[PDB]
A paper describes a structure:
The transcriptional regulator [name] from Desulfitobacterium spp. induces expression of halorespiratory genes upon binding of o-chlorophenol ligands and is reversibly inactivated by oxygen through disulphide bond formation. Members of this family are homodimeric and contain an N-terminal sensor domain linked via a long α-helix (involved in formation of the dimer interface) to the C-terminal helix–turn–helix (HTH) DNA-binding domain. We here present crystal structures of the oxidized ligand-free (3.2 Å) and reduced ligand-free (2.0 Å), OCPA-bound (1.8 Å) and DNA-bound (1.8 Å) [name] [name] in addition to an intermediate OCPA-bound structure obtained by soaking ligand-free crystals (2.0 Å).
Crystals of the oxidized, ligand-free wild-type [name] were difficult to obtain and only yielded data to low resolution (to 3.2 Å) using microfocus beamlines. However, the Cys-11 and Cys-200 residues of opposite monomers, respectively, part of each of these mobile structural elements, are likely to be in close proximity for most of the time. This explains the marked susceptibility of [name] for inactivation by oxygen through formation of the intermolecular Cys-11–Cys-200 disulphide bridges. Inactivation of [name] under aerobic conditions through Cys-11–Cys-200 disulphide bond formation is readily observed in vitro, although it remains unclear whether this process has physiological relevance.
Residue numbers in the entry:
A (entry chain B): 19 to 141, 149 to 226
B (entry chain A): 18 to 141, 149 to 226
Amino acid sequence: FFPIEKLRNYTQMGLIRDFAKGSAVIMPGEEITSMIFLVEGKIKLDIIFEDGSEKLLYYAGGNSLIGKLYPTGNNIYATAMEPTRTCWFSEKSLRTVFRTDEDMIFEIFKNYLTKVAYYARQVPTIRILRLFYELCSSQGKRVGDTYEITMPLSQKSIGEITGVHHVTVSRVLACLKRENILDKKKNKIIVYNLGELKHLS
Amino acid sequence: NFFPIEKLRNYTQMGLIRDFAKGSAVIMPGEEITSMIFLVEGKIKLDIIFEDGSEKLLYYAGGNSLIGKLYPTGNNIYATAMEPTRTCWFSEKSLRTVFRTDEDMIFEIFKNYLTKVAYYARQVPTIRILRLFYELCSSQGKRVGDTYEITMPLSQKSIGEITGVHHVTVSRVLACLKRENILDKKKNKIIVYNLGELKHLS
């Protein structure tokens, strides 16, 4: 949640909006321009990617801060998971705060910073040729200077298995190919240069 | 996306200018940073270290990026100026100056910062592993009674690479199958003790 309690002393500078259990909290592109400090309760922020798709992002426990003070590249769609109470902070209430006490400036920074740390700490190609070498070096059965693996394993499945976005499972499988490194010809995997796999892996 | 915050160029005087010839550690490893660093010319690779001396690259930073931090963060940072680079350092006591001189910046950063979380979160799951085995099984599995038996190495680590998966999970996940009863990975042997429920969960 990365709660920022300190701020509950400060909600009276806010717009308190209570929401029922399911009622959409940020719309999928209702335009949102304020920090939504979440005081009792819980919220599910998913992103709607621009295809139409769905995909979780992160929950918001009590005390957490969600929202934003800007248009910020993405469509959020967040549901109240349980009858939840929230205090909205416009920039101008937000201002009003900092004037009433600096420390909170930092307070949010901290909270943001942390959040950066966090997600950025977590954050392809090799995860691929790792999967392949794995297979080649177990299932590998020599055919002259290449090695054959008698298994379908289709683009979709490398994606799934590698947690890798298709355009990449393509480009790279394309590139493994173009290199006399690897054919996944329909049924069977033919590895032309194993030393070069191991090494890129 | 060196999420530059050009506005900050206007207040470097409230800051601390620290210059950094190429190759030079802008962030030593486990040296403690309590200042926003503001990149006023140049280019840094930030790396991290996992608590297991592992290294991998955190971001770049470019003309007008803000890296650095005002607090502890339980991350292990190693920045080096690729190019010769002018920085400028924001202690709190100093940003605390800037925000009085100029209360607007408080939002120009909050934006700034608020935005990378977008970014990152947007980029950013047990699924895979199973799935990894699942294909691995359906293709290689040699059914020994109710079990399906492949002969491979699968170093806990390789899985964590293959699958963009944190070691705790890989670990805490071979934990949850070998238990559950699904899968045992015991040395040079896969031994799936339930393909049906294996694909239910995938």
